[PDB]
Design a protein around this ligand. Structure first.
Ligand code: HEM
Ligand code: HEM
Lengths: 145, 146
């Protein structure tokens, strides 16, 4: 249930998401690409899905990857901005869920992003507490896949 | 001309006008995004068919898929606004969204149909022709990629 999953985003969780986003979302290009490179580096079996972007190993030097990465951070920005209204959060989550269903990405594989998120956040001094919060948000998308 | 040529041609004045108008128009993404789409469908009814995935686009705010689409479109514009000072960054995100439309057979001319609606929504907030023209220049950067 995408709606029950959305209900998991309590006041304490929303705060942790906002607090960490103040830092993580401040450098969308830089952090977006780092998130993607981490995903590819630690989950090589997901690289094939990103064929359109060309050679993702080039990281920041890859223009299509950079564009994809920046845009991904705006999807998260979108989510953050919908935390006040469950209905709006759900409709945008569904929109992106469709994008991933077309790419044949399951709830389980979408969840492979949690490891990379925990890692990049940890590098910015935002521990398991924050990783767990972001996992709850990722779980809303998972519920829609 | 290239997309970069269209992106690097955006002047300090055009960026100023884009930013000033976006501060207001982009502040309520849900409300103004849906208004933008509704306006496109009111004046360019021939484009309705392309949006069949969203369901009944005349349902406005009630239509959650239209709302989801509209809010996200406004974040695409947000993205654009945030990349104005770095042509390299603007071009790569413009190209990304260009692909989203190329795959749906949306031509440069068809994409440019969004200018009429933008001019009206901006006008409703008292941002006149100068601002409509500025936004037309940004839309043209995407057209350079279509
Ligand atoms: C925080 C988690 C994630 C977010 C918010 C996210 C967001 C996005 C966005 C905004 C797009 C562009 C959609 C489009 O224009 O069609 C996208 C594309 C894509 N995503 Fe994700 N995504 C996430 C995680 C993942 C993961 C873990 C996978 C794979 C296991 C995945 C696979 C894809 C693929 C293959 C594309 C298409 C790329 C292309 O060919 O342009 N995503 N994602
Ligand atoms: C300010 C100008 C516009 C921007 C920023 C923009 C942005 C977007 C975005 C972000 C998407 C989602 C892409 C995806 O996830 O696959 C989208 C989808 C789409 N756009 Fe646009 N767009 C603009 C104008 C137009 C115009 C004028 C047309 C039609 C003549 C058009 C036709 C489409 C179609 C058919 C879709 C697919 C909708 C769906 O089935 O989900 N767009 N657009």
């Amino acid at each position: 249930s995408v709606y029950d999953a959305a209900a998991q985003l309590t006041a304490d969780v929303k705060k942790d998401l906002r607090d960490s986003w103040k830092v993580w979302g401040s450098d969308k290009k830089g952090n977006g690409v780092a998130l993607m490179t981490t995903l590819f580096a630690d989950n090589q079996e997901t690289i094939g899905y990103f064929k359109r972007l060309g050679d993702v190993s080039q990281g920041m030097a890859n223009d299509k990857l950079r564009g994809h990465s920046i845009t991904l951070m705006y999807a998260l920005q979108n989510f953050i901005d919908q935390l006040d209204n469950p209905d709006d959060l759900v409709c945008v989550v569904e929109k992106f869920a469709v994008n991933h269903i077309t790419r044949k990405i399951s709830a389980a594989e979408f969840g492979k992003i949690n490891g990379p998120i925990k890692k990049v956040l940890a590098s910015k001094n935002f521990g398991d507490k924050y990783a767990n919060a972001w996992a709850k948000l990722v779980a809303v998308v998972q519920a829609a896949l």
